[PDB]
Amino acid sequence: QLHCSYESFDVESGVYSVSSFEAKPSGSVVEQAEGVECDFSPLLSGTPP
């Protein structure tokens, strides 16, 4: 990556920063809930407006 950043096959000696580690992510947990099955029954009969 350093060679590509300087577009060369001989980067000058030094200490150089390079991109950081992504820190090892793991599987999900949730606090989602609670409720009751939504009732859409007003749509099931009569004439719409």
Partner: protein, 463 residues
């Protein structure tokens, strides 16, 4: 309850007036008392060194920016190179400074140094109590490096609010100072070991290695105070000096402008870092500041319209940031050069230039470590209780017009002291101290019409 503010004129303090006089004699203002005192200054020498991950700052590993930023990778390289060069420049100034700080030789330093002078500046063998008070008075966030990952992480207090842990979210990196604080303490003690002293000609080869008090007397004779008085008042000198020294414990207040500047230098670094952090939440009209959030709610053909807008503003922020740091880096280098000059002048030697150093003539000055810089202290001499006295341009033999004298580094004044039978007397130029005129304090000069025609007793020359 307090009342109204009061309109007031700005005072115009006036100089003491002294009448100009014609003919062969003139009034001379001279102080009859003086006091020790100090001044201080802070000169920043460096900018904190930082780098920024140019991928994570914009996008935290999302797969769209893994492709979308590829066409912008050359902007990042320009950003990294500029910052990297700025960091190298800061470390060059450090090495260049220390090359002049070091001495070929120094005295070992022991307790009881300075004799009757207190010298509380001495390290608690250490840095110094004065330096440590400065670091404790500063409101700066808890130090970086260790414990690193574990001071961001839950292995610590819940009350930490350090931007340093936020550097592990944002991908920011703070580089360590080059010099090593322990070596820094050694450099300041090395400077203290060259004290006593600056006199005995250039001093650029040989080292006098003499007691501190003795070097002070040479500095006092360097400003025209006669040694006879100094030998009489030696305890007084130590006491007044220590009073000026004692005032430095009240110097850690906001009315000390140098102290205030140290805090502001710290504040400016914190502000620059926090400015980038605040921009992380700044949408550019994008639906959300989080890339993962907009990915989660958008169809990919329009998803990256939003991502592109977000990318453009984030890159623009980085460009502005680099420019700001480059300017600061250059000003710090220049500021460091000034400090370097003062170390090799104001500290390494007494100077007659005035202007420089504290405003009290110039007598010995000292320097200590400060955050991102150096803090200087200047001992000085303040005249008081000025009186006017009669004085002459010179004295000469009335029996032989080619025989003449004039005072060396002092003045010929009419005698007002009951111990001196002679009509004229010699005084030091920095202080009122009449004394007999002797060959030691005078030199032969070409004759002039304004020199007094002395028809009787002159011991220098007797003839």
């Amino acid at each position: 309850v307090p009342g109204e503010m009061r309109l007031a004129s700005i005072a115009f303090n006036h100089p003491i007036q002294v009448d100009q006089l014609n003919s062969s004699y003139f009034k001379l203002s001279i102080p009859t008392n003086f006091s020790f005192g100090v001044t201080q200054e802070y000169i920043q020498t460096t900018i904190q060194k930082v780098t920024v991950d140019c991928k994570q700052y914009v996008c935290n590993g999302f797969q769209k920016c893994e492709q979308l930023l590829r066409e912008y990778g050359q902007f990042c390289s320009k950003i990294n190179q500029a910052l990297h060069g700025a960091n190298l420049r800061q470390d060059d100034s450090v090495r260049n400074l220390f090359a002049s700080v070091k001495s070929s030789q120094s005295s070992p330093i022991i307790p009881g140094f300075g004799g009757d002078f207190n010298l509380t500046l001495l390290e608690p063998v250490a840095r110094s109590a004065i330096e440590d008070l400065l670091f404790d008075k500063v409101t700066i966030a808890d130090p970086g490096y260790m414990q690193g990952y574990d001071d961001c992480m839950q292995q610590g207090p819940a009350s930490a609010r350090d931007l340093i842990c936020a550097q592990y979210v944002a991908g920011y990196k703070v580089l360590p100072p080059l010099m090593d604080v322990n070596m820094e303490a050694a450099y300041t003690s090395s400077l203290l070991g060259s004290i006593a002293g600056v006199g005995w000609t250039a001093g650029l080869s040989s080292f006098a290695a003499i007691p501190f008090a003795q070097s002070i007397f040479y500095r006092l004779n360097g400003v025209g105070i006669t040694q006879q008085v100094l030998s009489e008042n030696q305890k007084l000198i130590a006491n007044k000096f220590n009073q000026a020294l004692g005032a430095m414990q009240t110097g850690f207040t906001t009315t000390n402008e140098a102290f205030h500047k140290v805090q502001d230098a710290v504040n400016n670094n914190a502000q620059a870092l926090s400015k980038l952090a605040s921009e992380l939440s700044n949408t550019f009209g994008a639906i959300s500041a989080s890339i993962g959030d907009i990915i989660q709610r958008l169809d990919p053909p329009e998803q990256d319209a939003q991502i592109d807008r977000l990318i453009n503003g984030r890159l623009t922020t980085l460009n502005a940031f680099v420019a700001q740091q480059l300017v600061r880096s250059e000003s710090a280098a220049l500021s460091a050069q000034l400090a370097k000059d003062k170390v090799n002048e104001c500290v390494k030697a007494q100077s007659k230039r005035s202007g420089f150093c504290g405003q009290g003539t110039h007598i010995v000055s000292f320097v200590v470590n400060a955050p991102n810089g150096l803090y200087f202290m200047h001992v000085g001499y303040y005249p008081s209780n000025h009186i006017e006295v009669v004085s002459a341009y010179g004295l000469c033999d009335a029996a032989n017009p080619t025989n003449c004298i004039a005072p060396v580094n002092g003045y010929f004044i009419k005698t007002n002291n009951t111990r001196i039978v002679d009509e004229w007397s010699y005084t030091g130029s920095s202080f009122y101290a009449p004394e007999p005129i002797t060959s030691l304090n005078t030199k032969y000069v070409a004759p002039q019409v304004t020199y007094q025609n002395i028809s009787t007793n002159l011991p220098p020359p007797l003839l």
